Amino acid sequence: PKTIYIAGPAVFHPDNGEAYYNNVRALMKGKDVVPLIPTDNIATGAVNIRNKNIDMIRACDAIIADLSPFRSKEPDCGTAFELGYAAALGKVLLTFSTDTRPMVEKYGSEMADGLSVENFGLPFNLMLHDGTDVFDSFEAAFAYFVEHHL
Amino acid sequence: HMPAPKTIYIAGPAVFHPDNGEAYYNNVRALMKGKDVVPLIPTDNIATGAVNIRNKNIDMIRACDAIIADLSPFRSKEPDCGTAFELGYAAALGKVLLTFSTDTRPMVEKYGSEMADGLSVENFGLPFNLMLHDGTDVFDSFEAAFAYFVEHHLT
């Protein structure tokens, strides 16, 4: 029974990600996979939340990271960190975003607020992209997983 | 003579500076002059192609003894996600993790509440997302993070 770490800023929504995770649970029910939900409200304190989340990344088979814009046109840094942790461990890396326009399109130019905008046809920072397509939703990323990863 | 200096990956959004970070990186080099430690500078203007840049940066992270990551606000009150990824990569490999920000106020002070624009703000007394904090002090500047490295990790 495989495990997927469910990374992303759903946890900051007013419902603490309840609807997002319920949707994730419903999709993976009965498919020999089980979600690993971040511990941001099952552990107490920043230290044990970080450690238990890291434990889940070490245990997972793949990570599905929601790189949708968070508070700006940039994805959530906590999700980015978890993706880097998973990448260093050789996990299967799957990402999606609700806005997959190239960064230069999102920002309107190759510079905003005095800072240059990456121009590689990618929707976000190039470190977050390992060659696999950026999917449109958790469903698309999860459907890709089941077909190519048992 | 320097057979085996320590190495530090210089992570952060300086690559997006209008000079591609040259003034920042030149100062990093000057700070390390004459010490048994050398900088590994992101390849963001070394290699062409997003694939090769990412591969080259990961090469440097795998090689490094420590990462000093600039987690200052980047285009918002949040740090740069590229730097955050590199910190996660280094953390998984067990590197020495050092971070700094030009704004070390807790997130709830930065955002002025525990919820901002319908999205909650972490309330753990940390200046940024708790994944990016491993227990070490958050320093004020590269200078401060590097001085901590010199005191504790150099010799």
XYZ file of C-alpha atoms in Angstrom:
305
model
C 0.000 0.000 0.000
C 1.697 3.143 -1.305
C 1.758 6.489 0.520
C 1.654 10.020 -0.920
C 2.590 13.144 1.022
C -0.091 15.783 0.410
C 1.938 19.002 0.337
C 0.433 22.437 -0.136
C -1.072 25.541 1.459
C -4.601 24.137 1.823
C -3.805 24.089 5.555
C -4.025 27.925 5.615
C -7.589 28.003 4.251
C -10.342 28.978 6.705
C -11.387 25.325 7.024
C -7.774 24.249 7.772
C -7.852 22.364 4.469
C -10.829 20.195 5.464
C -12.488 20.298 2.039
C -9.212 19.802 0.148
C -8.158 16.775 2.197
C -11.658 15.268 2.146
C -11.479 15.495 -1.643
C -8.037 13.862 -1.556
C -9.266 11.089 0.753
C -12.282 10.425 -1.481
C -10.161 10.110 -4.632
C -7.631 7.697 -3.119
C -10.186 5.473 -1.356
C -10.012 1.944 -2.737
C -6.908 2.336 -4.924
C -4.142 0.774 -2.728
C -2.794 4.247 -1.888
C -3.167 6.204 1.345
C -2.650 9.956 1.833
C -0.126 11.307 4.287
C -1.710 14.544 5.528
C 0.595 17.227 7.019
C 0.515 17.311 10.812
C -0.031 21.079 11.106
C -3.005 20.445 13.412
C -2.299 17.017 14.897
C 1.091 17.945 16.435
C 1.766 20.758 18.907
C 4.450 23.390 18.368
C 6.539 24.287 15.353
C 9.332 21.818 16.180
C 7.200 18.678 16.336
C 5.054 19.772 13.377
C 8.200 20.109 11.278
C 9.624 16.784 12.479
C 6.435 14.809 11.871
C 6.034 16.352 8.407
C 9.644 15.439 7.595
C 8.975 11.916 8.903
C 6.060 11.610 6.472
C 8.182 12.801 3.539
C 10.828 10.195 4.387
C 8.116 7.523 4.540
C 6.229 8.492 1.383
C 6.548 6.983 -2.090
C 5.607 10.223 -3.868
C 4.715 13.829 -3.092
C 1.878 15.738 -4.737
C 2.675 19.403 -4.138
C 0.155 22.199 -4.691
C 2.338 24.982 -6.167
C -0.633 27.295 -6.769
C -0.025 31.010 -6.092
C 0.022 31.684 -2.353
C -0.307 35.285 -1.087
C 1.447 36.465 -4.253
C 2.108 35.021 -7.698
C 4.691 32.668 -6.069
C 3.903 29.237 -4.579
C 4.031 28.529 -0.840
C 7.602 28.309 0.538
C 6.728 25.560 3.013
C 5.536 23.385 0.137
C 8.671 24.301 -1.821
C 10.798 23.143 1.128
C 8.969 19.833 1.312
C 9.437 19.331 -2.423
C 13.185 19.910 -2.039
C 13.338 17.479 0.875
C 11.523 14.869 -1.221
C 13.738 15.598 -4.253
C 16.920 14.999 -2.263
C 15.505 11.605 -1.185
C 14.674 10.575 -4.749
C 10.913 10.491 -4.235
C 8.470 10.678 -7.121
C 7.760 14.390 -7.574
C 4.353 15.545 -8.826
C 3.182 19.160 -8.821
C 0.178 21.164 -9.931
C -0.985 24.762 -10.016
C -4.308 26.467 -10.629
C -2.370 28.991 -12.775
C 0.148 27.441 -15.167
C 0.866 30.569 -17.226
C 4.604 31.291 -17.607
C 6.068 33.547 -14.929
C 6.642 36.398 -17.395
C 2.947 36.253 -18.311
C 1.896 36.326 -14.646
C 4.148 39.292 -13.875
C 3.696 41.165 -17.173
C 7.416 41.787 -17.768
C 10.868 40.339 -17.114
C 11.207 42.617 -14.060
C 8.793 43.467 -11.261
C 9.594 45.452 -8.106
C 13.231 45.702 -9.176
C 13.666 41.907 -9.365
C 14.053 39.912 -12.566
C 11.422 37.353 -13.593
C 12.565 33.931 -14.786
C 11.875 33.429 -18.492
C 11.994 29.669 -19.135
C 8.366 29.073 -20.110
C 7.756 27.761 -16.580
C 4.924 28.773 -14.209
C 7.188 29.166 -11.145
C 10.765 29.063 -9.881
C 12.808 26.651 -11.990
C 14.063 24.720 -8.942
C 10.481 23.421 -8.500
C 10.430 21.803 -11.947
C 12.151 18.469 -12.596
C 11.031 17.923 -16.221
C 7.604 16.417 -15.547
C 4.596 18.377 -16.772
C 2.908 20.703 -14.294
C -0.627 19.421 -13.831
C -3.786 21.494 -13.444
C -5.182 19.958 -10.250
C -4.670 17.330 -7.582
C -6.915 15.003 -9.608
C -4.710 15.340 -12.687
C -1.542 14.748 -10.652
C -3.128 11.808 -8.833
C -4.433 10.276 -12.072
C -0.903 10.519 -13.460
C 0.405 8.736 -10.343
C -1.945 5.740 -10.526
C -1.197 5.098 -14.200
C 2.601 5.307 -13.866
C 3.276 4.310 -10.233
C 1.203 1.227 -9.333
C 47.630 25.622 0.836
C 44.018 24.610 1.359
C 43.485 20.864 0.833
C 40.006 20.555 2.286
C 38.232 23.838 3.094
C 34.647 23.904 4.219
C 32.179 24.918 1.510
C 29.004 26.982 1.806
C 26.201 27.149 -0.744
C 25.102 30.793 -1.012
C 21.345 30.418 -1.464
C 18.880 33.227 -2.027
C 17.297 35.617 -4.488
C 20.449 37.613 -5.212
C 20.391 36.001 -8.669
C 17.353 38.219 -9.394
C 19.246 41.437 -8.550
C 19.665 43.818 -11.506
C 23.373 42.882 -11.583
C 22.601 39.145 -11.268
C 23.873 39.292 -7.668
C 27.464 40.341 -8.462
C 27.671 43.010 -5.739
C 26.225 40.616 -3.125
C 28.408 37.677 -4.154
C 31.540 39.831 -4.361
C 30.926 40.831 -0.747
C 30.425 37.162 0.227
C 33.786 36.394 -1.349
C 35.450 39.283 0.483
C 34.062 38.076 3.813
C 35.569 34.636 3.262
C 38.996 35.893 2.156
C 41.854 34.289 4.059
C 39.671 31.661 5.760
C 39.495 27.895 5.257
C 36.023 28.178 3.669
C 34.931 28.746 0.067
C 31.610 29.832 -1.474
C 29.500 27.845 -3.916
C 27.515 30.445 -5.868
C 24.261 29.515 -7.653
C 24.666 28.859 -11.343
C 21.575 30.898 -12.197
C 23.716 32.819 -14.696
C 26.309 30.053 -15.147
C 24.391 27.558 -17.275
C 21.687 28.150 -19.840
C 18.466 26.191 -19.701
C 16.301 25.656 -16.644
C 17.240 21.966 -16.521
C 20.972 22.605 -16.363
C 20.661 25.471 -13.860
C 18.650 23.273 -11.494
C 21.046 20.348 -11.953
C 24.084 22.581 -11.389
C 22.626 24.140 -8.244
C 21.742 20.708 -6.861
C 25.347 19.636 -7.565
C 26.526 22.483 -5.348
C 24.025 21.663 -2.593
C 25.117 18.030 -2.593
C 28.747 19.147 -2.369
C 28.365 21.745 0.371
C 29.241 21.600 4.076
C 26.587 24.250 4.933
C 23.916 26.352 3.259
C 23.447 30.009 4.157
C 19.977 30.873 2.849
C 18.607 34.400 2.426
C 14.989 34.043 3.594
C 14.265 37.791 3.433
C 10.883 38.838 2.013
C 10.713 38.239 -1.743
C 7.906 39.897 -3.759
C 5.666 39.536 -0.677
C 6.145 39.009 3.036
C 7.198 35.400 2.182
C 10.709 34.195 1.329
C 11.787 33.006 -2.097
C 10.414 29.528 -2.875
C 13.534 28.607 -4.828
C 15.675 29.221 -1.762
C 13.136 27.315 0.351
C 13.467 24.304 -1.992
C 17.252 24.418 -1.677
C 16.997 24.559 2.101
C 14.772 21.490 2.020
C 17.225 19.671 -0.238
C 20.101 20.508 2.121
C 18.062 19.520 5.177
C 17.346 16.062 3.724
C 21.084 15.559 3.148
C 21.922 16.571 6.714
C 23.796 19.792 5.929
C 24.419 22.604 8.394
C 21.434 24.926 7.868
C 21.866 28.660 8.410
C 19.256 31.266 7.507
C 18.859 35.016 7.670
C 16.251 37.667 6.954
C 16.288 41.447 6.809
C 12.903 41.200 8.625
C 12.937 38.822 11.603
C 9.609 39.973 13.092
C 7.186 37.088 13.751
C 4.743 36.409 10.918
C 1.743 37.647 12.918
C 3.498 40.984 13.374
C 4.371 41.153 9.662
C 0.780 40.390 8.641
C -0.798 42.312 11.529
C -3.152 39.450 12.451
C -3.495 35.673 12.705
C -5.477 35.733 9.446
C -4.744 37.886 6.400
C -6.797 37.932 3.181
C -8.673 34.826 4.267
C -5.462 32.834 4.799
C -4.133 32.006 8.248
C -0.766 33.211 9.564
C 1.429 30.807 11.547
C 1.728 31.882 15.193
C 4.886 30.222 16.551
C 7.046 33.313 17.042
C 8.973 32.620 13.805
C 9.540 35.088 10.933
C 8.489 32.652 8.191
C 7.022 29.213 7.477
C 7.981 26.823 10.276
C 9.409 24.213 7.873
C 12.241 26.653 7.208
C 13.307 26.757 10.879
C 15.355 23.936 12.439
C 15.943 25.445 15.902
C 18.926 27.619 14.946
C 18.683 31.389 15.437
C 17.533 33.335 12.380
C 20.305 35.837 11.643
C 19.889 39.405 10.432
C 22.218 39.337 7.408
C 24.631 37.169 5.482
C 27.365 38.768 7.636
C 25.707 37.520 10.813
C 25.055 34.011 9.485
C 28.616 33.695 8.231
C 30.083 34.977 11.477
C 28.096 32.246 13.243
C 29.562 29.675 10.813
C 33.090 30.968 11.538
C 32.555 30.661 15.293
C 31.003 27.187 15.307
C 31.781 25.287 12.101
C 35.048 26.556 10.630
C 37.866 25.045 12.701
